[PDB]
Ligand binder design. Structure first.
Ligand SMILES: NS(=O)(=O)c1cc2c(cc1Cl)N[C@H]([C@H]1C[C@H]3C=C[C@@H]1C3)NS2(=O)=O
Ligand SMILES: NS(=O)(=O)c1cc2c(cc1Cl)N[C@H]([C@H]1C[C@H]3C=C[C@@H]1C3)NS2(=O)=O
Ligand SMILES: NS(=O)(=O)c1cc2c(cc1Cl)N[C@H]([C@H]1C[C@H]3C=C[C@@H]1C3)NS2(=O)=O
Ligand SMILES: NS(=O)(=O)c1cc2c(cc1Cl)N[C@H]([C@H]1C[C@H]3C=C[C@@H]1C3)NS2(=O)=O
Ligand SMILES: N[C@@H](CCC(=O)O)C(=O)O
Ligand SMILES: N[C@@H](CCC(=O)O)C(=O)O
Ligand SMILES: N[C@@H](CCC(=O)O)C(=O)O
Ligand SMILES: N[C@@H](CCC(=O)O)C(=O)O
Lengths: 260, 270, 270, 260
């Protein structure tokens, strides 16, 4: 039985190679998550077919409709059998799907244009001159929405009541906006994506401050699925063997198309 | 029905109170683990009694006897209900118990006695003799060791990486034995060896010892791997899901980092 | 029975919301005073509705009529039950209303236009034509004035000190009048006078305005006196004791300090 | 009817006269509080005699016996008609006696012997090397005991479980201990007393950091007494007339037996 794998077009996790027009099957995709899915399939022993989610949504709940979208919705409603993708392990997602152990640690950080005047998040929140947003239908926005800390609550009040719209449909759109806003815009995104962007050409974006929190990416399965324990054990074995560290080093720092 | 909470005696996770002789119950202990357990019980309401394992061992399945020992050993045999302790998630451990999501990150690091500042315009510079695991595994003047019956020993035993393979090859055959039973024993060995012994311990305990007096140690190099501590639970238990949800709630509520800052960086003597 | 709370329209005690055209009730205002009202209503259970006085004046007595106006005026004649507003405690108001213990300290200070950077090794220094109330009293190039129907005006009127007597003597018969109808109008006059006019206002408002953009002002010298802000209440009312105990509770708990820090130093710039 | 006035031997509030052995009546006492009592009695129009409380204690609740001591207990039990003294206005005291409007501003400050490694109270609480204590049966002790902030809770747990005893019987004993402990001790006391001590010979003590909180001194009076409103009005009149400022300048800065 072929296992349908859902995933998102995110770099360096999934990319459509360079000549994908002449390739078919799983051979037209590449990245960290493709290699991770290959290793998971090798360990468990099943045939898999990578599928990109129809809408570039990670997963959230809509406006009082109680319907899941994105990869989480693709998993809950029986469309996909597993989700190997940069899916953050969160409170609301775990109650509806099973998350394996985190295969990559991360945190929420700030990226700006290339001694920064803001650095820490308190200084950026206090200074209302420079705008900042997040990725819609993601986990950073839901982290700010449900946070009870004063600084994060103030930041959420700022971003919610912002004119014009400060949210970005895609993280690539957020990166382009940061590059094109001449330093008047800041981006709140995951640390791994921030490092990958800042270490890539044209290398004009830099990451300031520390990490607001600490989270992780997990391999998700539908609630009550038979693949949960096998993929959890596969992730543990891969972490012990160092395959995850090798994959991160290959896909994050091996090329390094900038001077640093 | 009141369930028991087994734990190891390790700082700053669990520490004895200064006047703990006359207190009784959960009040005799203090640290990150005790109020972690308090907040876990607050999230899902239940009565807990703190206990310390008799052998004082983290847990590692033996050889040729096929018997689990330590916290894991007494957890699989139904003498403990939940282990809110710095137990490291490990593949062989996961096959016999259940772990929650990691509540604090960690890594294997190197602790050596802090060298004295070099005299040589008048800027003082700190130079250590070991700066990475590869040069530690290449030399022989400095000996290194791990904690007996722990996750680090098992990690070094089964590692196929060349540097770690050489590390374990030297560790297994070395007189006197380079292994210690208590983390405090290893720290004392580092502090008394006069910069000729290196301790391979967890990064969290390493940094905690760095932050406290007499601060005669330094952490060299980066973490050798990435792992995490998980709250243990035996298979076929109804407490696994509530515990996991409680850990997720505490992580998303900004409580785990607050406790980490309170117990690690606030009381920084050095 | 729901009592009414009347407040003055000044920042940062009570400020209009940005998109305030759509919300109704107590959600149309924000600031230190609305938080104080919320905590007062939390310490003792009662429903409150915020109101703004029609005249917009703090309160005093009118000449040759002996009729109170302002917040005190609408408090004495039964049109209000409590005034959680920056109302200065004076002797002429204590004989007609009740005042709780002060919840914030204040003092009459001097606000002038901030001078420029003195170019003359290469170090910038701040020099102002006015450094204290005495030299402001002798000099006549710079005019000065106080808010009309306030507490500072009544303090300067009823003063026997020679410097303050001279201050009042100049203020009374100036051409044109040096008094202003609103603190915002006085600050606008200071900003538009090109440094030839100085405003005598409370230290709290002066500091808050100095901390906020465009921050073209600064406070010179020290406070001319020590005074406090009280929560007013009509004479013979069954709310003075609970309000006073609530203020004491908030001061002991540190709520007043955190509210001051949040509304004065967590929103400033330059 | 002669009004009995209770007070405490505190400098510069009440001092015993340099030639007091040859004087009788109220003429054998001097200080800020003596002049304040004289002005209060002049405004109100009554004959008063100054009485020093039989124990040099301000007032507190003892161990579960529910009995007030010091000046507060000298007022509640119908032995003193008014208390003009450096009595802090507090939550517990107000429920039992009436406090007039404050006539002095103050706060809890730290006094040490003359790089200043201590700085604010955070670094003093985080460093257990140097001991710190307060005055027993006062307001600082009851401020730390009932505090709910982490720093103040930690400080109170430190002082309570400290061997040997760290609380001083009298504030003068605290100053002597600070001067003699070779700077291994830190005194927590009101800012007014701290300034007066640091501005007097031998001028070997100094005050660091700011004030943790803001409080005030108030003229107390038995609950349900006719003197409350007249003394409140008198304090307000003296504050508007600038007599309290003049008295503070006379008794705090007029002499200044130190070079600063
Ligand atoms: N260095 S890294 O970010 O690629 C990374 C991060 C992590 C890894 C493995 C790697 Cl390689 N494994 C851990 C998992 C493994 C076992 C121990 C903790 C969890 C369960 N999660 S992690 O701490 O998020
Ligand atoms: N900063 S820290 O080491 O105290 C720390 C470390 C971690 C935290 C929370 C904190 Cl505060 N939560 C994560 C958990 C949250 C969700 C995502 C990964 C696991 C499930 N594990 S973690 O990456 O091991
Ligand atoms: N630091 S501040 O100006 O916000 C401030 C000022 C004051 C506070 C509390 C604070 Cl936080 N409480 C005091 C009150 C408490 C008790 C002692 C004096 C009055 C009754 N009044 S105060 O001296 O006017
Ligand atoms: N400068 S000082 O400390 O001697 C000082 C301090 C204060 C004074 C008067 C003086 Cl002189 N009066 C005020 C009182 C007067 C009226 C206004 C606030 C209270 C009621 N309390 S105070 O703000 O605590
Ligand atoms: N990786 C995040 C989305 C990215 C973001 O929100 O910044 C998730 O899976 O929820
Ligand atoms: N935390 C480790 C023990 C510490 C060590 O082995 O260094 C474990 O749970 O196994
Ligand atoms: N706070 C003053 C008004 C401000 C002023 O007069 O400057 C009062 O309540 O009367
Ligand atoms: N002045 C304080 C006592 C001094 C102290 O506690 O430091 C009071 O009257 O309560």
């Amino acid at each position: 039985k072929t296992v349908v794998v859902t995933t998102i077009l995110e770099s360096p996790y999934v990319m459509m190679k360079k000549n994908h027009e002449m390739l078919e099957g799983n051979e037209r995709y590449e990245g960290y998550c493709v290699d991770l899915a290959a290793e998971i399939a090798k360990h468990c022993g099943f045939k898999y077919k990578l599928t990109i989610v129809g809408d570039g949504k990670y997963g959230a709940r809509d406006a009082d409709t109680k319907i899941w979208n994105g990869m989480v919705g693709e998993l809950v409603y029986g469309k996909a059998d597993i989700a190997i993708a940069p899916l953050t392990i969160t409170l609301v997602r775990e109650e509806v799907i099973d998350f394996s152990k985190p295969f990559m640690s991360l945190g929420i950080s700030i990226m700006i244009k290339k001694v920064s005047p803001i650095e820490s998040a308190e200084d950026l929140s206090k200074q209302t001159e420079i705008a900042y947003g997040t990725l819609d239908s993601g986990s950073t926005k839901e982290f700010f929405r449900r946070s009870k800390i004063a600084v994060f609550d103030k930041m959420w009040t700022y971003m919610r009541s912002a004119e014009p719209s400060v949210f970005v449909r895609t993280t690539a759109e957020g990166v382009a906006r940061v590059r094109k806003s001449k330093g008047k815009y800041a981006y709140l995104l995951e640390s791994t994506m921030n490092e990958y962007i800042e270490q890539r050409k044209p290398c004009d974006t830099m990451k300031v401050g520390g990490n607001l929190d600490s989270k992780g990416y997990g391999i998700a399965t539908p609630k009550g699925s038979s693949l949960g324990t096998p993929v959890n054990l596969a992730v543990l074995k891969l972490s012990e063997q160092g395959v995850l560290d090798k994959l991160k080093n290959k896909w994050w720092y091996d090329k390094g198309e900038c001077g640093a």
